[model samples]
Target: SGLVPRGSHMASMKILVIGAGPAGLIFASQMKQAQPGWDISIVEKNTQEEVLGWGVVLPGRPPRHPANPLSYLEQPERLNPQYLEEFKLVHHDQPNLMSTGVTLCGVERRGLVQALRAKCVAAGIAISYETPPASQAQLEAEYDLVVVANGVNHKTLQLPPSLAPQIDFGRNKYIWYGTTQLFDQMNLVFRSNAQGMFIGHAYRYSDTMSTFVVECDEQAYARAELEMRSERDAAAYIAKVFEAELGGHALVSQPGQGWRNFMTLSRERACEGKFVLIGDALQSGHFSIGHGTTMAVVLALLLVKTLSADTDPVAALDNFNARALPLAHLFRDHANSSRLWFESVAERMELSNADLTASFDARRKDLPPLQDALMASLGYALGRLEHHHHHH
Candidate 1:
């Protein structure tokens, strides 16, 4: 048995996935569960430790994963004292928009990735950290199927222009920060005082931490004088601005990710032969619409189902294109429109506080920034349309 080539099992399929991020890991985990005999390998360029960013504020419950070992998710309210059970929309300390009982779990980025990877490891999947595939040609020769689930900025694998990978930068500047402040309830703020309006969306994920997204227009950004300061200084400045609502907690910053514009990416094609793309590598949506992470998870699950349905990996990739890409287009377009709405939210602010406040509801002036506006933006998104409420 030792002399036998380990992966020579003709009964199983050989699959290699690049990137161990959300989509990549989920696809691997679910695929392993559905096709237990299949041999899967993952190659991640980044090291095992040192991931950037703070936490993710999922609009609703985070996607459930069988590999999840984090017990707090089961009873966030009871287990984590700082976890918020609902969200409150306020304008300068006053309830301007609306609040909901929906539980939007915010979790540490590092914790989530590790949990997913743990499941993959437990399933006997091999993952090589800090290793980039020497060549796609070499990998395809050894593996029956190759999948790329890396970020939007992929250096290897030449995707045909038909994928139409188009990326645009958003004008409004925003920064991600974490605070010791436990926002008892998830909070969204829209307010201004001479320096121009700012939008801060905060959510408490753990007993000691809550993530904050602070956004502002170009003029306001320039006036804020953040360019000359260090990341630490810039974060402190932001914390001071929101100190009233932050309950005197200090804002923390990550060196890797700083104040920058939101990124919008569109990829037209999903799969190419034995090579398949999922997650941000396939398509990207705006944070405002809450489509980025959710979209990635949805596509991962969809890929597993499609692959499990087809005996042939090629057919599965093709089936993935048919079923997955349409929703990709719909969400990307919806997120695009939602970003545009945010870009022009200043106009609503000029009109009146109530006017800007009502922007949360898509019915007013057709410029909604969340999920509802995505459905009504152009009357319909691509693919077969279905009517339903997307909780924000």
Candidate 2:
């Protein structure tokens, strides 16, 4: 955690972190803890009261030791134990569960932001609420290191066209909504209409609130005439589609929550000059697998460790990208594979429920076998040979 060398002539480093979401705030807090006297600031466009999404999942079993909880925290070597302790203290009264060797914990977006913000303040990290940099140039000129934790849709940190992140819009349309009915564990409820299959990923984040993401293929969306319907109407229709499982409950709409395509972003590199991307801005995996938040936090921690280990900012940024990009790609690949399976769920709906569940779980786990790989390889060769013959 020693940031400066003894009798060093250089002044404290100035760090600017954009986007005060989980990634930004956590990085700022950790950096402040590591270099107490360094000038660190976090800028967030959204106000203290504003949060766009719902719950965040931990995705695994709770740590066996309460003093050192490392489930969602990811890297224990890089993170302080107090961060986990503070997180647990905030959600100590919230609803959480352990099932099937996994621990699922959900917290409101606002509560999470507030908790992280408090940690940043306690660490003496300055936060500028409702203020965002005018441009990337301004940030690059002002700070020794600029960490971009802004989620997806950040246009300010554009890279060269050749190096731009690749974004794949999912074929299925999904709406993020909260429900009055709280789920016991993470639930994937699949229902079908004449057009196609609709699936819901539902999990309770609080005593009375749950995040219910309802998704369906493009054909199903068109067949239901969802494009013509208002936001409330579309939500109402989705509620009716899953009414039986909802148990007479209703869907609650939050600001900026509506039906939209899930986008997966993959980048070849995460660092450019003094600017380094983290969180959704760096990459976005499919939400169905429930690792979006985990990836963001893990990436931030890795960047902090890399920067702490290197005195040269440029070297640190390069090292951070080299270490983190591979993991990002792996997560993106698994998410894409899972997404393709869900896109074909309509055809699989005819299968038994248990069979379908097993297939879905296998895809989530990326457990496709060598037999399938051989078949895919042979299929590709045959297609190329057939095309060659047709040309003659």
Candidate 3:
């Protein structure tokens, strides 16, 4: 034993981390970088060569009031190395074209995850890939502290009684697929078949690829027999559904994933005794407004900073409970509001294209009715002008 550093609680602490994704990887590397004396280990169920997702949308510049929500997108740091492409937003409809406005950034989902993996490896931390999953009984019992960073629907860490999580499921079935198709702008494309209406939320993440997530009400999901399709077949089906938008380009999928039911995971208290949850395991924001990935990164940063403040791990968690939960809860609630707005489309399927177009523009963060009607009419007039110029 050498000279002890004061105010540092983590010296020679044994910490076990589950999941090698952004949450765990970032936490592992940063903790080692800042507090080198800590003994850290990581476990990932998937192999190193296996990549998890396609593309993730990041806010161009996240809003700040409480805890900065997803500023990792604008991060001038390691977690986000190459989020080069930026996409402007405006939801569009098929029957009639209308517009809304916003700004966001993107990164190939693989790009972000691999970068985090390399950082972990560079830090000389051991990662046990294809490892067996362990519950809190095995994890918390051994290490001085345990961090559960495995993402949504994680099997490794069960919720302990101390943390009260409110999870909500999306009414629409969302399938995440990447296409060689490039969309310079974000679009909401609506199409139909005998099964029912399906909506495409499309945006380009790279020069060659766009993330085209398909959302259909449960009726369409079951009626279309989507659950029965394989990954390639599901891509083929959805690519065909958005064929004209894809412009002959193809959609791609990861090895085993097909249709996903979006799960929004939230918790007011992130700690359960010595075991703490971080990342999407902490809070899953909605995709329309969901920055679950960024939320994951943010949580890791906050956790590291907060953990150092107290020698008592549980005491640090008490501070963490107050600092972390408020902003994530605020973001999660906003995400749910957007998710609910999406559900209403099924009922209003009979409206005219122009009317639906105007309504679609209004759904962006629930713009007030006066502004919704006023600005929608303004957009409609501009649309009419463009239509006039193109008129043959």
Q: Which is the leading candidate under TM-score?
A: 1
RMSD in angstroms between candidate 3 and the native structure over all alpha carbons: 11.7
TM-score, cand. 3 vs. native: 0.77
lDDT of 2: 0.67
Residue 16 in model 3: lDDT: 82
lDDT of 2 by residue, 80-165 (tens): 11111111100111322223333555656666667677778777888888885656556656776678788886565553343477
Candidates sorted by lDDT, best first: 1, 2, 3
**Model 1 Cα lDDT, one tens digit per residue, 328-371:** 77777777776777777766755544665456655223333334
Q: lDDT tens digits, residues 1-392, model 3?
A: 11112244656688888888888877887778768878888988888878766777664534331112233223434333223343232223343333323345556677677766766776788888999767657665677777878878544456576565677788888877888877766666767667877888877776677788888888888897888887778677777777778878887767777677678888768776667888888888668754566566666766776665545666676656665676567657667777877776877667766676667545654433322332332232223445333422
lDDT of 2 at 69: 20
Candidate 2 collision pairs: 60-103
lDDT, residue 345, model 2: 84
Q: What is the alpha-carbon lDDT of model 1 when measured against the actual structure?
A: 0.68
Q: How close is candidate 2 to the true structure, as a TM-score?
A: 0.81
lDDT of candidate 3?
0.66
Least lDDT summed over 10 consecutive residues: which range in candidate 1? Answer: 1-10
